Design a protein around this nucleic acid. Sequence first.
DNA 1: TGCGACGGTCTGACGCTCTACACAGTGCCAGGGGGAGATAAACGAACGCTGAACGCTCCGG
Length: 158
Amino acid sequence: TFKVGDTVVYPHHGAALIEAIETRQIKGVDKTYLVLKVAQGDLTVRVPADNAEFVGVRDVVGQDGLDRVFEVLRAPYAEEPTNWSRRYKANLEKLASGDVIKVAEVVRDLWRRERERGLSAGEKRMLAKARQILVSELALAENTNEDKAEALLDEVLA
DNA sequence: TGCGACGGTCTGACGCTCTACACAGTGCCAGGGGGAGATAAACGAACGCTGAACGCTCCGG
């Protein structure tokens, strides 16, 4: 399931690459510890393989991923409650859900409501964070990375 | 009640000046009533314009 030299995406940090496999023991119990790091936060994440599905790691989605994200990115008839408090409580929960599709409609709704009205600048921080984590994710998912990954969105978001 | 002691309470604790200085860890947006501030009009008065008019010294045929 998990190998060395491949890339897997971690929640709240974007995609990352696996360095090697260690044999660290926690609470005196030996575990198959896997270590990986990201270049954004400059932090190393150590997660055992037994609870990898429990902690919520996902592998890189192949061709199936881009077509479904593009289709949802353009889905019309999207509605939200009039009160901003319910949407404010829902957006971070959907971000913490970790689904690529879910964060796709979240960022599409956020971008369209930011362009149509210009809400505020406080929400722009998490908007930019979501944009950064999605462009880091689609770096390996769509096989386009860095500036090329950012460029592809520039003409498909409208 | 008389006793001590235990306790809180309270006060200052000589004097200026050469010198002398400043001060920090936890939300957010929409709707709505005032008032300053730009716009064009408007009430009122006087400020110009029309040369005209009152009246003198005037060079004058």
